[PDB]
Scaffold this active site. Structure first.
Site: not given
Ligand code: HEM
Ligand SMILES: [Ca+2]
Ligand SMILES: [Ca+2]
Ligand SMILES: [Cl-]
Ligand SMILES: *[C@@H]1O[C@H](CO)[C@@H](O[C@@H]2O[C@H](CO)[C@@H](O[C@@H]3O[C@H](CO[C@H]4O[C@H](CO)[C@@H](O)[C@H](O)[C@@H]4O)[C@@H](O)[C@H](O[C@H]4O[C@H](CO)[C@@H](O)[C@H](O)[C@@H]4O)[C@@H]3O[C@H]3OC[C@@H](O)[C@H](O)[C@H]3O)[C@H](O)[C@H]2NC(C)=O)[C@H](O[C@@H]2O[C@@H](C)[C@@H](O)[C@@H](O)[C@@H]2O)[C@H]1NC(C)=O
Ligand SMILES: *[C@@H]1O[C@H](CO)[C@@H](O[C@@H]2O[C@H](CO)[C@@H](O[C@@H]3O[C@H](CO[C@H]4O[C@H](CO)[C@@H](O)[C@H](O)[C@@H]4O)[C@@H](O)[C@H](O[C@H]4O[C@H](CO)[C@@H](O)[C@H](O)[C@@H]4O)[C@@H]3O[C@H]3OC[C@@H](O)[C@H](O)[C@H]3O)[C@H](O)[C@H]2NC(C)=O)[C@H](O[C@@H]2O[C@@H](C)[C@@H](O)[C@@H](O)[C@@H]2O)[C@H]1NC(C)=O
Ligand code: HEM
Ligand SMILES: *[C@@H]1O[C@H](CO)[C@@H](O[C@@H]2O[C@H](CO)[C@@H](O)[C@H](O)[C@H]2NC(C)=O)[C@H](O[C@@H]2O[C@@H](C)[C@@H](O)[C@@H](O)[C@@H]2O)[C@H]1NC(C)=O
Ligand SMILES: *[C@@H]1O[C@H](CO)[C@@H](O[C@@H]2O[C@H](CO)[C@@H](O)[C@H](O)[C@H]2NC(C)=O)[C@H](O[C@@H]2O[C@@H](C)[C@@H](O)[C@@H](O)[C@@H]2O)[C@H]1NC(C)=O
Ligand SMILES: *[C@@H]1O[C@H](CO)[C@@H](O[C@@H]2O[C@H](CO)[C@@H](O)[C@H](O)[C@H]2NC(C)=O)[C@H](O[C@@H]2O[C@@H](C)[C@@H](O)[C@@H](O)[C@@H]2O)[C@H]1NC(C)=O
Ligand SMILES: *[C@@H]1O[C@H](CO)[C@@H](O[C@@H]2O[C@H](CO)[C@@H](O)[C@H](O)[C@H]2NC(C)=O)[C@H](O[C@@H]2O[C@@H](C)[C@@H](O)[C@@H](O)[C@@H]2O)[C@H]1NC(C)=O
Ligand SMILES: *[C@@H]1O[C@H](CO)[C@@H](O)[C@H](O[C@@H]2O[C@@H](C)[C@@H](O)[C@@H](O)[C@@H]2O)[C@H]1NC(C)=O
Ligand SMILES: *[C@@H]1O[C@H](CO)[C@@H](O)[C@H](O[C@@H]2O[C@@H](C)[C@@H](O)[C@@H](O)[C@@H]2O)[C@H]1NC(C)=O
Ligand SMILES: *[C@@H]1O[C@H](CO)[C@@H](O)[C@H](O)[C@H]1NC(C)=O
Ligand SMILES: *[C@@H]1O[C@H](CO)[C@@H](O)[C@H](O)[C@H]1NC(C)=O
Ligand SMILES: *[C@@H]1O[C@H](CO)[C@@H](O)[C@H](O)[C@H]1NC(C)=O
Ligand SMILES: *[C@@H]1O[C@H](CO)[C@@H](O)[C@H](O)[C@H]1NC(C)=O
Ligand SMILES: *[C@H]1O[C@H](CO)[C@@H](O)[C@H](O)[C@H]1NC(C)=O
Ligand SMILES: *[C@H]1O[C@H](CO)[C@@H](O)[C@H](O)[C@H]1NC(C)=O
Ligand SMILES: [Ca+2]
Ligand SMILES: [Ca+2]
Ligand SMILES: [Cl-]
Ligand SMILES: [Cl-]
Ligand SMILES: [Cl-]
Ligand SMILES: [Cl-]
Ligand SMILES: [Cl-]
Lengths: 306, 306
Positions: B35, B38, B41-43, B46, B50, B64, B70, B139, B169-170
């Site tokens: 978390s 993430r 990234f979301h900071d 946008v 910052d 946000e 979010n 995205p 997403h590993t």
């Molecule tokens: C490439 C486009 C990307 C899309 C469309 C995307 C979309 C999503 C979505 C829909 C989720 C599920 C959120 C939820 O149900 O809590 C998520 C979780 C996540 N994203 Fe991505 N994401 C993307 C790129 C990234 C990037 C660049 C990173 C960080 C470098 C990232 C790190 C994570 C992590 C670690 C989770 C799990 C968060 C949690 O367990 O709280 N994502 N993402």
């Molecule tokens: Ca920002």
């Molecule tokens: Ca893994």
């Molecule tokens: Cl994400």
């Protein structure tokens, strides 16, 4: 008394007819073979393999379908109606619903990759159902190993039968409400059941959050969810049993069931041999023969009124 | 401009302090490292890295945190408050929330088994947040591959950065509502997405039934759900990507991203090298330096009123 040749004259093709309906049902529900064998088990343990679970409520029947172990859980009844329709088309008034559930159990196993065996036939359909007895005798997923053995022994099934027939959880689904006690507050301890693999505990916590919908379902076999095979047993070796009553066959201190689990994990053919013998035993519980009882035209009703 | 030595005089131990709070948080939440990265990234996407996502609603701020990407999804904000408290105890008024999120991302990766790297520091905290821009630029999990590339290119990130950073997403979790279009009625076709492994399709149908709670969650990485490793990529090779935007990196006809996926599946060290370089790039988007902006005392508020 029962015999595999019971319909050899009166309905020569019955097992092929049953098989063909389940093959058709699998086109829209991959879970149907698991649900059907469960119906056979839940019939057999309640006054015997006599169709009792299939009856609906009427003026005189209080259906077993609303006993706690069946209510919002047992399924496949419309597919059973379809099997009965197909069998009555070919052989009207010949094949009992109690036997249709027995054949359906066996064909559901074989079509899922499991063993085939000659199915003893000649059971008749009951006129009665007993919801209270279903509540009492169908085993709960919260029983200890000694309580599971007792529950099976009350049906004439022994420790090997318990382990072999629990292998039917090599396929099929279970709702959160049947294992979520293992996830947060196990046996009043306040903590998770430590015999659950920690990775599976996290998986199951994800899908069964503590205040959530206890009807959400997961695979009883996280490794091969639809294939009838010995992976149920090798799952227990890595603490991947989903129900408490699954994992206890392996993890209970000093249990004689552990060795049977490890044998069946290593030798799928030994599991299949035991599973066949146990199924035949389960299929001979409390059966009506001669007649006694009747051959229903419609599995949901007694012949004639209420 | 940014430099890993930015706090070498003013808060010499900051990265150890951040690491220690996340190590503590992991005692009660195995998901916290996912978390936190993430949130970083979301900071960054946008208005730049910052701190903008951390601000709460006030007389002047529309947070946000309630942008669609979010709202009821982003998490870890109390753990961020705990990191800031610990850093302000040791080094009051020194370390920005924008930098705390950057360090927290990196330490979350390394503590989960991933690479470590020297984190460039020196970012400042914004006075503003922009919910509409978050809705527009973060995205969606329904984007096509070409749309994902565009979305990343708008941030100065290229095709390699897309594939490497999607490897985050590993670990971590995704709710049903973010992939359930793949399960029943994909792209208005009425049928499931055929690039989903059929066994995973059945698993996901079990937990995300068509009329059910779209908030239920599953692991983004069905193979190693908490370990930061290359299994995300080898999952795509067997069609085990959970989001549409995950599987498209592998399965899109004629995609240049396929080769990058297969390389990272076979060579975890190549993935880790790319992931580091991409993280540093992402960490340098739109940063405030000199001063510009401020060093917040409390990550949720601007210093002084509203
Ligand atoms: C490439 C486009 C990307 C899309 C469309 C995307 C979309 C999503 C979505 C829909 C989720 C599920 C959120 C939820 O149900 O809590 C998520 C979780 C996540 N994203 Fe991505 N994401 C993307 C790129 C990234 C990037 C660049 C990173 C960080 C470098 C990232 C790190 C994570 C992590 C670690 C989770 C799990 C968060 C949690 O367990 O709280 N994502 N993402
Ligand atoms: Ca920002
Ligand atoms: Ca893994
Ligand atoms: Cl994400
Ligand atoms: C639908 O299924 C339900 C659940 O099975 C049926 O109800 C059960 O019916 C059985 C009889 O089949 C009842 O068991 C009997 O209870 C008598 C009273 O027991 C109480 O009092 C005793 C002191 O007098 C005390 O010792 C008991 O522990 C209890 O507090 C017993 O006397 C009787 O024992 C004698 O007979 C049995 C043979 O059945 C024999 O084995 C014994 O050695 C005795 O000589 C018997 O006890 C049994 O308990 C269960 C096991 O622990 C034992 O192995 C048994 O011996 C049972 O109480 C009842 N349960 C409930 C929840 O009502 C139901 O049966 C019908 O409806 C009930 C109300 C009753 O009228 C039955 O006679 C009916 O057949 C089924 N419904 C239908 C329509 O069939
Ligand atoms: C919070 O974030 C949101 C979302 O980013 C901000 O709102 C966006 O603000 C941008 C400006 O930064 C607006 O884009 C601009 O729109 C003008 C009008 O466009 C319309 O009319 C055109 C015909 O006149 C037509 O061609 C357009 O397609 C559209 O129908 C454009 O003229 C303007 O283009 C010119 O200037 C840009 C530089 O910004 C330059 O690059 C161009 O070449 C032009 O000379 C610009 O267009 C952009 O569209 C997005 C991309 O497609 C392009 O690359 C850009 O050029 C945008 O419309 C607006 N979106 C929404 C949903 O409101 C918001 O900004 C503030 O609030 C808005 C309402 C506005 O007043 C902004 O000026 C404010 O800064 C952010 N909130 C805060 C508090 O900052
Ligand atoms: C040993 C004690 C047993 C217990 C405690 C037990 C308990 C359960 C429970 C709680 C479920 C989940 C029901 C649901 O959520 O739909 C279930 C499913 C199942 N049971 Fe068992 N059961 C046992 C023995 C057996 C036996 C003997 C068989 C058949 C030979 C069997 C076959 C099945 C099958 C196939 C399913 C999946 C059904 C479906 O997907 O519809 N069980 N069982
Ligand atoms: C449970 O019942 C089984 C009968 O269905 C027992 O297996 C049977 O054992 C008989 C000798 O006791 C033998 O004649 C049968 O061939 C054999 N049938 C089958 C299908 O295996 C079973 O006994 C256990 O398992 C067998 C293989 C032997 O090794 C016995 O020594 C075991 O006790 C019964 N299980 C128990 C726990 O009693
Ligand atoms: C929890 O499930 C894990 C995934 O199946 C088990 O790990 C696997 O266990 C096998 C031994 O039976 C072994 O060959 C595999 O290498 C191992 N796989 C992985 C990916 O870790 C885990 O088993 C425990 O932990 C592993 C690391 C070993 O140390 C085993 O000795 C442990 O039993 C399962 N945990 C339990 C308690 O069964
Ligand atoms: C995406 O941006 C990367 C910079 O972060 C590019 O990698 C860099 O390529 C430079 C030559 O163009 C080289 O000087 C840098 O050492 C290298 N940096 C890293 C961290 O690898 C990347 O270019 C692709 O990948 C590298 C390994 C080369 O094989 C290039 O030929 C590739 O195009 C950029 N990706 C794209 C798709 O442009
Ligand atoms: C769906 O996931 C299955 C489980 O991971 C995949 O099967 C595995 O794929 C491996 C090849 O990359 C292979 O070494 C394994 O033996 C196999 N494992 C099992 C238990 O089946 C499956 O891959 C497809 O189906 C199997 C039977 C092979 O024929 C592969 O060639 C197929 O790709 C995954 N399906 C897809 C489309 O990726
Ligand atoms: C089995 O499940 C259904 C849901 O499909 C329940 O509504 C039934 O509950 C029973 O009937 C309702 C109207 C209420 O009186 C309740 O207390 C009853 O339990 C349920 N049937 C049984 C026997 O549990
Ligand atoms: C984010 O999620 C919360 C749930 O925790 C929603 O209640 C918010 O919905 C918004 O506010 C409510 C009162 C209602 O007016 C609704 O239409 C709004 O969308 C939500 N916030 C946003 C911006 O979606
Ligand atoms: C959960 O509850 C809802 C609300 O009534 C219900 O429709 C559904 O059948 C339940 N089960 C699942 C698995 O969502
Ligand atoms: C296991 O359980 C019962 C009860 O202890 C025992 O009598 C039976 O013989 C045992 N079975 C095996 C295979 O050891
Ligand atoms: C599902 O809906 C319920 C009902 O409000 C809610 O409490 C819960 O947070 C939701 N999510 C999950 C995963 O159960
Ligand atoms: C992939 O995508 C873009 C757009 O086609 C391209 O320009 C870029 O160089 C490609 N990257 C790789 C590694 O092939
Ligand atoms: C579990 O939590 C605690 C025990 O530590 C107790 O207060 C509570 O009664 C338990 N829950 C149940 C369902 O027994
Ligand atoms: C999916 O189902 C059919 C298309 O075959 C259509 O009626 C419906 O609009 C589609 N659903 C969505 C959400 O578009
Ligand atoms: Ca019965
Ligand atoms: Ca299986
Ligand atoms: Cl059952
Ligand atoms: Cl599942
Ligand atoms: Cl049989
Ligand atoms: Cl999961
Ligand atoms: Cl960085």
């Amino acid at each position: 008394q029962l015999t595999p040749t019971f319909y050899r004259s009166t309905c020569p093709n019955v097992t092929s007819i049953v098989r063909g309906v389940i093959q058709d049902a699998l086109q829209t529900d991959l879970r149907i073979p698991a649900s059907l064998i469960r119906l056979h088990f839940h019939d057999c343990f309640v006054n015997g393999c006599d169709g009792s679970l299939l009856l609906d409520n009427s003026d005189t029947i209080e259906s077993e379908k609303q006993a706690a172990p069946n209510n919002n859980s047992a399924r496949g009844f419309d597919v059973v109606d379809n099997i009965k329709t197909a069998v009555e088309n070919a052989c009207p008034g010949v094949v009992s619903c109690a036997d249709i559930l027995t054949i359906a159990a066996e064909q559901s196993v074989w079509l899922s990759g499991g063993p085939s065996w000659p199915v003893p036939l000649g059971r008749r359909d009951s006129l009665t159902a007993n919801r209270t007895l279903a509540n009492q005798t169908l085993p709960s997923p919260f029983l200890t190993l000694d309580q599971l053995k007792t529950d099976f022994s009350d049906q004439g099934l022994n420790t090997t039968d318990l382990v072999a027939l629990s292998g039917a959880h090599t396929f099929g689904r279970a709702q959160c409400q049947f294992f979520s006690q293992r996830l947060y507050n196990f046996s009043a301890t306040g903590s998770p059941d430590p015999t659950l693999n920690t990775t599976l505990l996290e998986t199951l916590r994800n899908i069964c959050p503590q205040g959530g919908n206890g009807s959400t379902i997961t695979n009883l076999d996280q490794t091969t969810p639809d294939a009838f095979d010995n992976k149920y047993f090798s799952n227990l070796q890595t603490q991947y049993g989903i129900l408490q009553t699954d994992q206890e066959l392996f993890s209970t201190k000093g249990a004689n069931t552990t060795a049977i689990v490890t044998k069946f994990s290593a030798n799928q053919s030994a599991f299949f041999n035991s599973f066949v013998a146990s199924m035949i035993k389960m299929g001979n519980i409390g059966v009506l023969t001669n007649d006694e009882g009747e051959i229903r035209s419609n599995c949901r009703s007694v012949n004639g009124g209420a």
